[PDB]
Write a protein that binds this ligand. Structure first.
Ligand code: GSP
Length: 304
């Protein structure tokens, strides 16, 4: 199953560049922008410049109608770059001109083409003002009605989880953790055949046309290693929705040879309780003898 990560706008490409510098293998990146000046500094193995005649190589100057029309008009090259993909993550800063307008349509392209399409967008800092927060909003709703399932990140939460000293690029990286977690997690299920296996059909089942989504990976060792990992796993302070009310869950548990039944049940109960609802849970496990004292819980939860 081939996974493609698509940045749309400068935000999206920064997202991409950081994720490359982090090193993610067996995921194919695509950078997409109106701004040529940007794309020239992207590390993406594949780049697509859109709205060329609309903007002559400049960004969309905070009118999304431009990013929209731009992409809608470079559809065919986009499609060629997409093709061969089973799942696509569409990543974008909402509020700009390019992202807000083009991103909803990259994903609508991606959905019609048949891909399982996950939106991962940022809402902007309150300090960017009301007007941007509203353009951002319009984007997010287009993105919701355009994808299978959407992840939203109000940028303001960074200010809540950062200390007064943290460089800006660090805060943005911490926001990247969401995308990195989903991508690494799914990539990992797909690549490994478990004792109780999860595969891509399960991903399709919990993620197709489900609205809001949470994606986590939690890692821990110690006494309560399984409760602690499942608790790390299901908890971003960076999201718009919590886990509560979830209606679909896919959950994988990876451990060494001492992975107990009792504690697999314990992590699964962390989750099942946490939704506060009768869930459709699909459950899987992997015993990786390399792993010594630590376990990793991968959780993907939708249905809000
Ligand atoms: N969290 C995070 N947010 C970003 C980043 N880059 C931009 N943003 C936010 O996302 C929004 C849009 O990002 P940006 O890439 O500048 O828009 P654009 O679509 O490129 O807009 P334009 O070039 O046509 S004007 C901005 O309002 C900003 O708040 C980033 O690297 N990390």
């Amino acid at each position: 199953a081939t996974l493609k990560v698509i940045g749309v706008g400068g935000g999206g490409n920064n997202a991409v560049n950081r994720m490359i510098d982090h090193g993610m293998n067996n995921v194919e990146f695509i950078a997409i922008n109106t701004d040529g000046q940007a794309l020239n500094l992207s590390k993406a193995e594949s780049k697509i410049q859109i709205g060329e005649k609309l903007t002559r190589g400049l960004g969309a100057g905070a009118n999304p109608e431009i990013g929209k029309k731009a992409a809608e008009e470079s559809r065919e090259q986009i499609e060629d770059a997409i093709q061969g993909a089973d799942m696509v993550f569409v990543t974008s800063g909402m509020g700009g001109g390019t992202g807000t307008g083009a991103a909803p349509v990259v994903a609508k392209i991606a959905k019609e083409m048949g891909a399982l399409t996950v939106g991962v967008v940022t809402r902007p800092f309150s300090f960017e003002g009301r007007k941007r927060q509203t353009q951002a909003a319009a984007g997010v709703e287009a993105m919701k009605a355009a994808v299978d399932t959407l992840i939203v990140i109000p940028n303001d939460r960074l200010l809540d989880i950062v200390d007064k000293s943290t460089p800006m690029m660090e805060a943005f990286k911490e926001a990247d953790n969401v995308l990195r977690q989903g991508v690494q997690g799914i990539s990992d299920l797909i690549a490994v055949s478990g004792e109780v296996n999860l595969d891509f059909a399960d991903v399709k089942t919990i993620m197709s046309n489900q609205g809001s989504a949470l994606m986590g990976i939690g890692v821990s060792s110690g006494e309560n290693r399984a409760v602690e990992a499942a608790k790390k796993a299901i908890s971003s302070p960076l999201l718009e929705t919590s886990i509560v009310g979830a209606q679909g869950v896919l959950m994988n548990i990876t451990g060494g040879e001492s992975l107990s039944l009792f504690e697999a049940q314990e992590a699964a109960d962390i989750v099942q309780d946490a939704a506060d609802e009768d869930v459709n849970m699909i459950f899987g496990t992997v015993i990786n003898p390399e792993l010594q004292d630590e376990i990793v819980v991968t959780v993907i939860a939708t249905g809000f």
